[PDB]
Design a protein around this ligand. Structure first.
Ligand SMILES: NC(=O)c1cc(F)cc2[nH]c(-c3cc4c(s3)CCNC4)nc12
Length: 350
């Protein structure tokens, strides 16, 4: 309203700093907001909860001392307070359950970063809250024009890598933002020397984007479980928009999601057809490529700004005996990522 920014950037700001969305996420996790309000989330409590889920997972893998598991499960729920209403707390006693609680803590941490940013500052200004909260992201955000080559390439990227199989949605690009986080340029400069820099997708929940833009994509901490990281704790990317879009966790409820395009300096790829928890790459390798059954057609590889864009249609790869439908790319150093675009997408569920 009293803001200098174009309306798409303003709506982006409202969307990622939306306190109702934060509380709704907590309510949907069935968190007791009387015992743990949005405003009283702590990094230290969440780090301790991460550790417990790691111990839970260890206890599962060894051989359930069924009461020590229940003792760990109870300790988790004491630390992170829940209100399940009529049902009982679901026992944390398998991999899928540990992973869901870990995803919840990831979400909670970024929500806490968003809320601390929102309440931080002096809390009185001549400028309106949109411009002021825009500033706290430490990210220059510009609208890419629909009639530019970048918008066209990016829209083609979305079109061709929308996997018309197990897709319950058509995808529509509403806005394209060009983004530059403070310090990404200098942190990334050495890695610009690596060969094989690619423009790749990274999806995440909308309530995580205030944290992602202020802090960059991060690697899960040591305390957190490794369950569900097919290739260890790193930063994950796809060359198929629908693979990453699944990580937006968008529902028929909220059919709007945010997805990143990152330039990532892959270098020599450690190529793998099966899960393998990576803690250090072999010498000479700078990334992991999970080998999918379907890969973008290399004929239609193109470039913008010297970064390769694999927007080719999904064809067959020469890889039998793989656990993966689509490729994944993983780097283990945060400085190997340069976030270049942020898309607001509408999911049209069929
Ligand atoms: N975001 C992405 O675009 C993405 C793209 C991929 F090709 C593979 C991915 N794997 C993951 C994550 C795994 C886990 C998370 S995120 C939270 C904790 N439990 C495991 N994300 C991706």
């Amino acid at each position: 309203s009293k803001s200098k920014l174009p309306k798409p950037v303003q709506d982006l700001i409202k969307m990622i700093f939306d306190v109702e969305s934060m509380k709704k996420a907590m309510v949907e996790y069935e968190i007791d907001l009387q015992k743990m309000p949005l405003g009283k989330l702590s990094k230290r409590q969440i780090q301790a909860a991460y550790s417990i889920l790691s111990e839970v997972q260890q206890a599962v893998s060894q051989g359930s001392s069924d009461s020590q598991i229940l003792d760990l499960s109870n300790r988790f729920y004491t630390l992170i307070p829940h209100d399940f209403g009529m049902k009982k707390p679901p026992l944390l006693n398998n991999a899928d359950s540990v992973q869901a609680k870990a995803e919840m803590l990831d979400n909670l941490l970024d929500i806490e970063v968003a809320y601390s940013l929102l309440r931080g500052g002096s809390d009185d200004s001549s400028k309106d809250p949109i411009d002021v909260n825009y500033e706290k992201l430490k990210t220059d955000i510009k609208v890419v024009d629909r009639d530019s080559e970048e918008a066209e390439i990016i829209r083609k990227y979305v079109k061709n890598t929308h996997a018309t199989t197990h897709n319950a949605y058509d995808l529509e690009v509403i806005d394209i933002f060009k983004i530059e986080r403070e310090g990404e340029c200098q942190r990334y400069k050495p890695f610009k020397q690596l060969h094989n820099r690619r423009l790749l997708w990274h999806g995440s929940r909308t309530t995580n984007f205030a944290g992602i833009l202020s802090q960059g994509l991060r690697i899960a901490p040591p305390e957190a479980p490794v369950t569900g990281y097919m290739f260890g704790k790193g930063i994950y990317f796809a060359d198929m928009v629908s693979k990453s879009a699944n990580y937006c966790h968008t529902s028929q409820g909220d059919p709007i999601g945010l997805i990143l395009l990152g330039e990532v300096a892959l270098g020599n790829m450690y190529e793998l057809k099966h899960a393998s928890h990576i803690s250090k790459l072999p010498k000479g390798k700078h990334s992991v490529k999970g080998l999918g059954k379907t890969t973008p057609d290399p004929s239609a590889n193109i470039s913008l700004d010297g970064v390769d864009v694999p927007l080719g249609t999904g064809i067959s790869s020469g890889v039998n005996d793989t656990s993966l439908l689509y490729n994944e790319y993983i780097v283990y150093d945060i400085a190997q990522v340069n976030l270049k675009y942020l898309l607001k997408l509408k999911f049209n569920f069929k």
